[PDB]
Amino acid sequence: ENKTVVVTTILESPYVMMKKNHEMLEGNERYEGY
Amino acid sequence: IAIAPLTITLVREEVIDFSKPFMSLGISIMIKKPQKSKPGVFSFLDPLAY
Amino acid sequence: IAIAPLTITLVREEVIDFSKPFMSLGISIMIKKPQKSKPGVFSFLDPLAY
Amino acid sequence: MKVGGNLDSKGYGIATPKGSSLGNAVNLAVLKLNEQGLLDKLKNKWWYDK
Amino acid sequence: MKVGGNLDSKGYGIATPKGSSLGNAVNLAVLKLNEQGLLDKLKNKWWYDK
Amino acid sequence: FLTVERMVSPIESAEDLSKQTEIAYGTLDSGSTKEFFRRSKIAVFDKMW
């Protein structure tokens, strides 16, 4: 059935970066990037 | 699944599967750079010495 | 097997298999070269400024 | 400063477990956006627009 | 004359009938050669050296 | 200075192609290019098609 897929990655600019307001964020929204 | 700046190599293929590459690239060399400002009035008297 | 400079597209994947792409490229635009132009009168003032 | 040319040709692609179920359809989507050209647009979004 | 930049990104690959068995091992050998880089020297042969 | 090293470019890019009629341009049939443009969504590419 519909389940959550585990997506792995690495902190890379500009691939994966942390938002300025990630502290007040939750889950996947805590991230930003290509 | 992995969605990240991951280099695809044969040995990595030998253990898991990969899609078609989306961004082609190559090895590059990074160094420091000298930044010489283009002078103004001094561009005139440049050649010899003051 | 097709061992040839074949472009790989979705619909082509939709019917057959392709290995991992080995040589990357892009669309290219070709024209006739003109002859080396001669400046003419402009050489009187051409350099040093507009 | 980035100096010198490229050394070889290798790119980035999505990684899936050997025998993963989605890998095919995922690769299909990659081909879609590739034919949808949004890829290099995003490349401008995270590389060139800033 | 080649003018302007490339329009997009796409490359060549070996095509096989969808569902053939040889495609996997062929892909493997292709990757091996790509790491072996001999394909580059061949590119110099059929593009540059002549 | 004083050299014929000009090598003028009559065309800049596809952008120049979309805005002129002097020089025609086409492609090869039974090829991917025609499909790319026929399915292209870029404005300039659309007008070119």
mmCIF file of N, CA and C in Angstrom, chain E:
data_model
loop_
_atom_site.group_PDB
_atom_site.id
_atom_site.type_symbol
_atom_site.label_atom_id
_atom_site.label_comp_id
_atom_site.label_asym_id
_atom_site.label_seq_id
_atom_site.Cartn_x
_atom_site.Cartn_y
_atom_site.Cartn_z
ATOM 1 N N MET E 1 31.303 26.291 -40.050
ATOM 2 C CA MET E 1 31.487 26.892 -38.739
ATOM 3 C C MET E 1 30.371 26.464 -37.802
ATOM 4 N N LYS E 2 30.769 26.082 -36.593
ATOM 5 C CA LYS E 2 29.854 25.864 -35.482
ATOM 6 C C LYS E 2 29.680 27.177 -34.732
ATOM 7 N N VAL E 3 28.442 27.660 -34.640
ATOM 8 C CA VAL E 3 28.159 28.935 -33.990
ATOM 9 C C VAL E 3 27.266 28.695 -32.785
ATOM 10 N N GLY E 4 27.322 29.616 -31.827
ATOM 11 C CA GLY E 4 26.475 29.557 -30.658
ATOM 12 C C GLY E 4 26.809 28.392 -29.746
ATOM 13 N N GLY E 5 26.111 28.356 -28.617
ATOM 14 C CA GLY E 5 26.257 27.258 -27.690
ATOM 15 C C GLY E 5 25.329 26.107 -28.012
ATOM 16 N N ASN E 6 25.456 25.046 -27.225
ATOM 17 C CA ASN E 6 24.586 23.894 -27.392
ATOM 18 C C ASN E 6 23.188 24.210 -26.879
ATOM 19 N N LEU E 7 22.191 23.578 -27.495
ATOM 20 C CA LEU E 7 20.814 23.852 -27.106
ATOM 21 C C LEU E 7 20.421 23.097 -25.846
ATOM 22 N N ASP E 8 20.838 21.842 -25.721
ATOM 23 C CA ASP E 8 20.465 21.022 -24.579
ATOM 24 C C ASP E 8 21.505 19.926 -24.401
ATOM 25 N N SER E 9 21.165 18.938 -23.578
ATOM 26 C CA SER E 9 22.095 17.876 -23.219
ATOM 27 C C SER E 9 21.481 16.535 -23.576
ATOM 28 N N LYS E 10 22.164 15.785 -24.435
ATOM 29 C CA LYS E 10 21.767 14.428 -24.775
ATOM 30 C C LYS E 10 22.954 13.737 -25.426
ATOM 31 N N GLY E 11 23.044 12.423 -25.225
ATOM 32 C CA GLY E 11 24.184 11.668 -25.695
ATOM 33 C C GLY E 11 23.752 10.399 -26.401
ATOM 34 N N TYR E 12 24.748 9.599 -26.760
ATOM 35 C CA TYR E 12 24.534 8.374 -27.512
ATOM 36 C C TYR E 12 24.669 7.166 -26.600
ATOM 37 N N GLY E 13 24.078 6.054 -27.023
ATOM 38 C CA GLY E 13 24.190 4.815 -26.288
ATOM 39 C C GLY E 13 23.921 3.640 -27.204
ATOM 40 N N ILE E 14 24.223 2.455 -26.699
ATOM 41 C CA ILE E 14 23.992 1.226 -27.442
ATOM 42 C C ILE E 14 22.549 0.794 -27.233
ATOM 43 N N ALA E 15 21.881 0.432 -28.323
ATOM 44 C CA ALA E 15 20.488 0.018 -28.284
ATOM 45 C C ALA E 15 20.366 -1.486 -28.494
ATOM 46 N N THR E 16 19.449 -2.090 -27.747
ATOM 47 C CA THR E 16 19.172 -3.514 -27.794
ATOM 48 C C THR E 16 17.666 -3.722 -27.734
ATOM 49 N N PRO E 17 17.168 -4.841 -28.265
ATOM 50 C CA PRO E 17 15.731 -5.119 -28.168
ATOM 51 C C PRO E 17 15.284 -5.187 -26.717
ATOM 52 N N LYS E 18 14.169 -4.518 -26.432
ATOM 53 C CA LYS E 18 13.655 -4.457 -25.072
ATOM 54 C C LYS E 18 13.403 -5.855 -24.528
ATOM 55 N N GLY E 19 14.150 -6.215 -23.491
ATOM 56 C CA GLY E 19 14.068 -7.537 -22.913
ATOM 57 C C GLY E 19 15.185 -8.480 -23.297
ATOM 58 N N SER E 20 16.155 -8.032 -24.088
ATOM 59 C CA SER E 20 17.288 -8.883 -24.420
ATOM 60 C C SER E 20 18.193 -9.057 -23.206
ATOM 61 N N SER E 21 18.968 -10.139 -23.219
ATOM 62 C CA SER E 21 19.818 -10.461 -22.080
ATOM 63 C C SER E 21 21.196 -9.823 -22.168
ATOM 64 N N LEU E 22 21.733 -9.645 -23.375
ATOM 65 C CA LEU E 22 23.102 -9.165 -23.517
ATOM 66 C C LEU E 22 23.280 -7.751 -22.986
ATOM 67 N N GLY E 23 22.219 -6.948 -23.000
ATOM 68 C CA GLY E 23 22.290 -5.545 -22.641
ATOM 69 C C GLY E 23 22.994 -5.251 -21.334
ATOM 70 N N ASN E 24 22.757 -6.086 -20.323
ATOM 71 C CA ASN E 24 23.362 -5.856 -19.017
ATOM 72 C C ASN E 24 24.883 -5.939 -19.097
ATOM 73 N N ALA E 25 25.400 -7.093 -19.524
ATOM 74 C CA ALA E 25 26.844 -7.276 -19.609
ATOM 75 C C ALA E 25 27.477 -6.257 -20.545
ATOM 76 N N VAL E 26 26.806 -5.958 -21.658
ATOM 77 C CA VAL E 26 27.308 -4.937 -22.570
ATOM 78 C C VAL E 26 27.457 -3.610 -21.844
ATOM 79 N N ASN E 27 26.415 -3.195 -21.122
ATOM 80 C CA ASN E 27 26.497 -1.986 -20.310
ATOM 81 C C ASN E 27 27.696 -2.046 -19.377
ATOM 82 N N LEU E 28 27.919 -3.207 -18.762
ATOM 83 C CA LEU E 28 29.054 -3.367 -17.863
ATOM 84 C C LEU E 28 30.369 -3.079 -18.578
ATOM 85 N N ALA E 29 30.592 -3.719 -19.730
ATOM 86 C CA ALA E 29 31.837 -3.510 -20.460
ATOM 87 C C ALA E 29 31.986 -2.058 -20.896
ATOM 88 N N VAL E 30 30.882 -1.432 -21.309
ATOM 89 C CA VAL E 30 30.915 -0.015 -21.655
ATOM 90 C C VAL E 30 31.434 0.802 -20.486
ATOM 91 N N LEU E 31 30.848 0.602 -19.306
ATOM 92 C CA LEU E 31 31.307 1.314 -18.121
ATOM 93 C C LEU E 31 32.786 1.070 -17.874
ATOM 94 N N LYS E 32 33.223 -0.183 -18.005
ATOM 95 C CA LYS E 32 34.634 -0.499 -17.817
ATOM 96 C C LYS E 32 35.507 0.334 -18.745
ATOM 97 N N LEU E 33 35.158 0.371 -20.031
ATOM 98 C CA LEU E 33 35.930 1.165 -20.978
ATOM 99 C C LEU E 33 35.917 2.637 -20.600
ATOM 100 N N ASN E 34 34.773 3.135 -20.128
ATOM 101 C CA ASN E 34 34.682 4.540 -19.748
ATOM 102 C C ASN E 34 35.642 4.853 -18.610
ATOM 103 N N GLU E 35 35.689 3.986 -17.599
ATOM 104 C CA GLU E 35 36.717 4.141 -16.579
ATOM 105 C C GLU E 35 38.105 3.917 -17.159
ATOM 106 N N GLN E 36 38.235 2.999 -18.116
ATOM 107 C CA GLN E 36 39.515 2.777 -18.768
ATOM 108 C C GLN E 36 39.925 3.933 -19.667
ATOM 109 N N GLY E 37 38.995 4.815 -20.023
ATOM 110 C CA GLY E 37 39.314 6.025 -20.749
ATOM 111 C C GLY E 37 39.830 5.837 -22.157
ATOM 112 N N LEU E 38 39.997 4.595 -22.616
ATOM 113 C CA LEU E 38 40.481 4.368 -23.974
ATOM 114 C C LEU E 38 39.546 5.005 -24.993
ATOM 115 N N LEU E 39 38.260 5.099 -24.648
ATOM 116 C CA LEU E 39 37.298 5.762 -25.519
ATOM 117 C C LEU E 39 37.720 7.194 -25.807
ATOM 118 N N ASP E 40 38.320 7.861 -24.820
ATOM 119 C CA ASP E 40 38.805 9.218 -25.029
ATOM 120 C C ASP E 40 39.890 9.258 -26.093
ATOM 121 N N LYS E 41 40.897 8.393 -25.967
ATOM 122 C CA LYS E 41 41.967 8.348 -26.954
ATOM 123 C C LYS E 41 41.415 8.029 -28.334
ATOM 124 N N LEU E 42 40.404 7.160 -28.396
ATOM 125 C CA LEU E 42 39.738 6.898 -29.665
ATOM 126 C C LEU E 42 39.060 8.156 -30.193
ATOM 127 N N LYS E 43 38.454 8.941 -29.298
ATOM 128 C CA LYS E 43 37.905 10.225 -29.709
ATOM 129 C C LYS E 43 38.987 11.113 -30.300
ATOM 130 N N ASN E 44 40.189 11.058 -29.734
ATOM 131 C CA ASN E 44 41.293 11.810 -30.309
ATOM 132 C C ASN E 44 41.646 11.285 -31.692
ATOM 133 N N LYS E 45 41.558 9.966 -31.881
ATOM 134 C CA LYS E 45 41.843 9.381 -33.187
ATOM 135 C C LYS E 45 40.866 9.878 -34.239
ATOM 136 N N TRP E 46 39.577 9.672 -34.005
ATOM 137 C CA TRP E 46 38.589 9.911 -35.042
ATOM 138 C C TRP E 46 38.065 11.341 -35.056
ATOM 139 N N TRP E 47 38.487 12.177 -34.112
ATOM 140 C CA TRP E 47 38.124 13.587 -34.081
ATOM 141 C C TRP E 47 39.313 14.520 -34.232
ATOM 142 N N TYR E 48 40.393 14.287 -33.493
ATOM 143 C CA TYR E 48 41.473 15.259 -33.412
ATOM 144 C C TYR E 48 42.708 14.886 -34.208
ATOM 145 N N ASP E 49 43.199 13.654 -34.072
ATOM 146 C CA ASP E 49 44.523 13.322 -34.591
ATOM 147 C C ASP E 49 44.570 13.381 -36.112
ATOM 148 N N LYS E 50 43.413 13.321 -36.768
ATOM 149 C CA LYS E 50 43.365 13.340 -38.224
ATOM 150 C C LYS E 50 42.713 14.614 -38.738
#
